[PDB]
Design a protein around this ligand. Sequence first.
Ligand SMILES: C[C@@](O)(CCOP(=O)(O)OP(=O)(O)O)CC(=O)O
Ligand SMILES: C[C@@](O)(CCOP(=O)(O)OP(=O)(O)O)CC(=O)O
Lengths: 321, 323
Amino acid sequence: GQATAIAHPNIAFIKYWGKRDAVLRIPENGSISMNLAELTVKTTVIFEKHSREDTLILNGALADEPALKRVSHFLDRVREFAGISWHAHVISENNFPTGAGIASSAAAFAALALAATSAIGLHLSERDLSRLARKGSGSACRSIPGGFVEWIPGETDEDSYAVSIAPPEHWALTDCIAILSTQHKPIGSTQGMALASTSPLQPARVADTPRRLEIVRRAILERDFLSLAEMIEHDSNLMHAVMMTSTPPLFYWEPVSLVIMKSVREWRESGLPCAYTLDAGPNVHVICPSEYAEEVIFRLTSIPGVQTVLKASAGDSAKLI
Amino acid sequence: GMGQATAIAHPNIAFIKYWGKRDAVLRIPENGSISMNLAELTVKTTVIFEKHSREDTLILNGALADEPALKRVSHFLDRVREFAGISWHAHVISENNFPTGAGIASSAAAFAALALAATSAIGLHLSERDLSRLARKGSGSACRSIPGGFVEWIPGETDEDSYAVSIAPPEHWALTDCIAILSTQHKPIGSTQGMALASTSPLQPARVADTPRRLEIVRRAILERDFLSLAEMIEHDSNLMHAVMMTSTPPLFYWEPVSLVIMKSVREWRESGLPCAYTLDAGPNVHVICPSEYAEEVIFRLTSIPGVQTVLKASAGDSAKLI
Ligand SMILES: C[C@@](O)(CCOP(=O)(O)OP(=O)(O)O)CC(=O)O
Ligand SMILES: C[C@@](O)(CCOP(=O)(O)OP(=O)(O)O)CC(=O)O
């Protein structure tokens, strides 16, 4: 059996940081994100005759050990579930600008979940596909549904999954991603959030998340940009507050990251609707209503140290092709 | 000419930070703090109670003080008036040897010196603990510049419970503060207004409740001259304060880009074997603490970082003194 699927990465408005269960990737708190339409990972899976091990090809080129074992552990779960035991070849390609530092694990494992299961015979619901991708990478469960998506955190494998809050056409928002010229290789999200419990501030951050989800959920449903802008910056800062107060500390910000954050707030306060948010790295995602995207990109491009700015709109669910 | 006295005090650098007031008027803090006085920086204040003054007068480095500064100093002198049962107004002449435009806070040294000089002029004889409580009411961190050396501010929940004591004299540990002054066209939000927002941060209660653990480690590290324990805690404590600042509503981003450069460098330097650690107050300047034998190397490395205007060098100073 063989199948091919595509999926988009997503930008979290309310962040996932810290696991309640390491192996199942049940998060400590819920999260909300938006799919990025112009960024895509395409993956084909082919289970085979008498193959005794899986093999992974990422962008025409062969994959390294860690990436393979990740993908093979994930395919093990798809085997137990389908009652089959064939191994497979996995061919994935992404249109991500090279050296941008756009994390791919969410899109990667959302496309794998959809391609692997469908190639092996199953027809999982969106909700069960979300639960499946979650076990590859937490944030992958949010790229299974389309548009603006909420991860319901839960306390069990059955209870932790994502659902669409609103389709992409509900709100014309754009994510302008400032790629930072100078950036090295920061500690990975998995390793980084495993340290969250060393932070004196993580329990309070986690306890407070329902307040933040409720504000962002309503802001998306009501198309209330100011309420969203202030909360996504607040929420980004709460995550980075925990990172910077972990032991050892995780300082994902670059100096230019600081300039952009301060500028974005200044732009909004002087009449340009926009807001920043950052993941586990120095690039800055600037969310704005799309009418303002070209003004936001202009100002961003003018900031010394900004290598380039990518433009992205709200994307759809993962899909078989 | 009813009485006259002159006192000097030093500013201090907090290893465990004061951020957030429990009581705005009394300046009782939400949490305790530990600081080291800085020997090479001084505020000298003379107070002269006059029979013919109907209002106070404040001269700073030979120039009449701005209106807000006189208000601060005049309200504080009202406290002194009340605690002495005397109504004289005063001429307050003050001078300091700070580098001009460097952004180094002088409020702790200012009100420490004023507390000592004003009470001495008006004829009182206050114990160090009571002087500490008085200076606290001008500026919280001023209560830590009354005792000498390394100083702990016991936070308390009442006016009488909130005071500072010296936990070790300056000569107990040769530590140097290499202060990196950062070029900047930005006027930061003052510490008073900034920390009034601390209750808006979701993370402030957790920061506050964790303070005794942080103070225990720093208090003992000073006794033991345990620099690595001190280093890691003061960077963690600095980061916890700025975490609350940046998660306030509206947020307070006191760091400039070069502040981040220095913070990461200092961590690299210590990890490569040069003992030193950073801590930041409510502004972009970075205080780098090191055992004094490494000061010259730390200053050398700091001075070559683009955006560092200059580097000041300070050692542990003594208590506020009547001269
Ligand atoms: C910082 C983030 O981007 C988190 C990404 O976390 P991951 O999905 O990469 O973590 P794993 O479950 O270990 O794969 C914020 C977010 O997207 O919510
Ligand atoms: C950030 C700090 O330097 C605090 C300075 O606070 P202030 O003593 O200036 O506050 P007020 O009581 O309002 O005068 C950290 C510290 O010194 O502990």
